[PDB]
Design a protein around this ligand. Structure first.
Ligand code: NA
Length: 321
């Protein structure tokens, strides 16, 4: 009359292995879950489950739910105006988004893309699936990893063509991307990531947007730029033709007084990344949002969506879908 927990549930990006015996799922039987460990790490459990008296597989912590295989994030082979050419593995989360004008995003997990709302607003509201490409440095190459949007979430505080407050969006991909050295997600900022995002701290913008030549780049470029004091950045946009209060608390600014280093038209949606020097992992602190019309203009800093403000929103959507 012994209870049978049956076959273990499927562990996405993982595997079930029988400890007691091949295919034995009766009371007291033990199994071990593991992840594809090169690119994924097991979270919330050590993966040891046992058949309980109630017919359920339960962890060492007594949880009825599965462990989670989570893509390793923030790896880089490092360890756009006035920049230089990226190398393979430099920005493996970098995503190209087509359909409208050139835009970009950053891979999260193995099935989400973080981008700017302004970059995808028109396409989403024309009910057109987004053509999403990764694993390539060359914008116009026929060789890339193809993904397709299943859903686009635009922040509900964003108002298209009326300022860039809340300029953030999430794309759910219809399939998991195969994670490798050339394709890995960026890390979301942890609580204390602000300690690496103070005035004068260095972030990196990457993209295929306009260079100093005034044309899009064929190959992925990047620049390191300092975070700019918020009041200083606010004052820089306190003039025509900008509407009052264009720079908000949901934005950070980055760039030089001289304009020598900047993100431009076409860089939209890209992640402004920073290095957590303690974990040695890169994370996304900003999204390429807006700036003055002319790229690399002196005294007109690039303005980025302040990603850390949207962690609850991001976690709400990713957890719920
Ligand atoms: Na500008």
């Amino acid at each position: 009359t012994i209870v049978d927990c049956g076959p273990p549930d499927d562990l996405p990006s993982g595997r079930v292995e029988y400890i007691t015996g091949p295919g034995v799922t009766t009371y007291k039987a033990v199994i071990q879950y593991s992840c594809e460990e090169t690119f994924y790490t097991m979270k919330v459990n050590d993966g040891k489950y046992v058949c309980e008296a109630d017919g359920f597989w339960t962890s060492s912590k007594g949880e009825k739910s599965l462990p989670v295989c989570e893509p390793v994030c923030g790896l880089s082979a490092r360890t756009i105006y006035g920049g230089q050419k990226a190398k393979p593995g430099d920005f493996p989360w970098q995503v190209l988004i087509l359909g409208g004008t050139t835009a970009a995003g950053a891979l999260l997990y193995d099935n989400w893309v973080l981008t700017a709302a302004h970059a995808v607003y028109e396409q989403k509201h024309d009910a057109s699936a987004l053509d999403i490409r990764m694993g390539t440095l060359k914008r116009l190459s026929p060789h890339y990893t193809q993904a397709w949007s299943e859903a686009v979430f635009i922040h509900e505080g964003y108002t298209h063509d009326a300022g860039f407050d809340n300029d953030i969006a999430l794309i759910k991909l219809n399939n998991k991307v195969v994670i490798n050295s050339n394709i890995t997600p960026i890390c979301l900022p942890r609580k204390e990531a602000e300690s690496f995002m103070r005035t004068d701290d260095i972030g990196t913008a990457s993209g295929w947007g306009l260079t100093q030549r005034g044309f899009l780049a064929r190959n992925l470029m990047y620049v390191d730029i300092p975070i700019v004091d918020h009041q200083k950045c606010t004052a820089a946009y306190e003039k025509p033709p900008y509407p009052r209060g264009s720079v908000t608390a949901n934005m950070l600014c980055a760039g030089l007084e001289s304009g020598g280093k900047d993100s431009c038209r076409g860089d939209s949606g890209g992640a402004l990344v920073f290095l957590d020097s303690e974990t040695e992992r890169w994370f996304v602190g900003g999204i390429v949002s807006w700036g003055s019309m002319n790229c690399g203009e002196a005294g007109q800093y690039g303005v980025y969506t302040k990603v850390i403000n949207y962690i609850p929103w991001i976690e709400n959507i990713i957890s719920d879908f």
